[PDB]
Amino acid sequence: TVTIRTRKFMTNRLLQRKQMVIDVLHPGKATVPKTEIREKLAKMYKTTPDVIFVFGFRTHFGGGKTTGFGMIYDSLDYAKKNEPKHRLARHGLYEKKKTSRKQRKERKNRMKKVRGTAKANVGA
């Protein structure tokens, strides 16, 4: 029912990955999730569904055709090496600190207020 056709296929060895744009055809249905097209592209390219990253999926008027951008890596270490941190956090492979900019700024000003070893003591 739901088919995947791709275009603009290019392979670069300088990033150890292959990237392409993905066209999804799902007539009379809601827009597809990322996990289903990830495992479908995993079945298409004979790759484990853990180094495939997809993002930026928009919907045309009518909903017959949806486009998006994806990429296929070569191993998990290359995907952990050169990728944005937010997309790895979306895949759950990275966690970011839950501190706001504000309290960090008064913390930085409070260590700027005092001089010596007590900078680490006043930072709490």
Binding site: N12, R13, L14, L15, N82, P84
Partner: protein, 262 residues
């Protein structure tokens, strides 16, 4: 201001960089280099637009700093390095090389070249200098000071140097009847043969260059880059051969390609 500027806006960029408008407020100001700021092409725009190997600013750094890009033989680790006219870019991993040459319009174009041709770079001499102990110096357009040149090299000639040695191999004298191409100005990238040159004392000299189709024109002397002897070139020409088609005939061949594509 109180010092040198460090920022560049998007609309203040030169048009041959030819990038967009709404996707950002600041533009990549190139680092200090051999070429001037107006006609140079920094590596980040070329990598993320002409080849589309990267998408973001940090991805260009993750391309560049790992000793994967060789500009004029040596490796460059700066994303804003100005790669100007007549420079070779080497991709050792993928396996092709590029030469930065002007297209028939006022912009740079990608040129796939064979690797064994990518061992020499043409340089245009700017001035002749004598060192502190009678040492002749040969200052080129890319600020590459060459010591002990041939005595036959005059002020406005061109030389062919070797990249891995930095030494002179061949040269072409500047006279009537040589294949020249125009760098800079409103006229840009045209391929023609020099016909005559006048001399103006105290003013800019102007030459007259005839196109291979007979469409003669005239540019200033400082915008002159001779590349060939007679009509046989040395470097590989790009598509269109710098012929400057007036708008009707490339409209006609665009329509012709429209029915030929189907």
């Amino acid at each position: 201001a109180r010092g040198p500027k460090k920022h560049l806006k998007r609309v203040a960029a030169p048009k041959h960089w030819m990038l967009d408008k709404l996707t950002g407020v600041f533009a990549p100001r190139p680092s200090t280099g051999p070429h001037k700021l107006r006609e140079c092409l920094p590596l980040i725009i070329f990598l993320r637009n002409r080849l589309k190997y990267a998408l973001t600013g940090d991805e260009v750094k993750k391309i560049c700093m790992q000793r994967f890009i060789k500009i004029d033989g040596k490796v460059r680790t700066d994303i804003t390095y100005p790669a100007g006219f007549m420079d070779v870019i080497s991709i050792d991993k993928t396996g092709e090389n590029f030469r930065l040459i002007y297209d028939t319009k006022g912009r740079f174009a990608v040129h796939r070249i064979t690797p064994e041709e990518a061992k020499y770079k043409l340089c245009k001499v700017r001035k002749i200098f004598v060192g502190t102990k009678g040492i002749p110096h040969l200052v080129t357009h890319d600020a590459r000071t060459i010591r002990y040149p041939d005595p036959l090299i005059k002020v406005n000639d061109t030389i062919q140097i070797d990249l891995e040695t930095g030494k002179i191999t061949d040269f072409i004298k500047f006279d009537t009847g040589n294949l020249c191409m125009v760098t800079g100005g409103a006229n840009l990238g045209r391929i023609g043969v020099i016909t005559n040159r006048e001399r103006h004392p105290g003013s800019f000299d102007v030459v007259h260059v005839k196109d291979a189709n007979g469409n003669s024109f005239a540019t200033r002397l400082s915008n002159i880059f001779v590349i060939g002897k007679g009509n046989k070139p040395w470097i590989s020409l790009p598509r269109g051969k710098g012929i400057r088609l007036t708008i009707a005939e490339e409209r006609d061949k665009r329509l012709a390609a429209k029915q030929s594509s189907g």
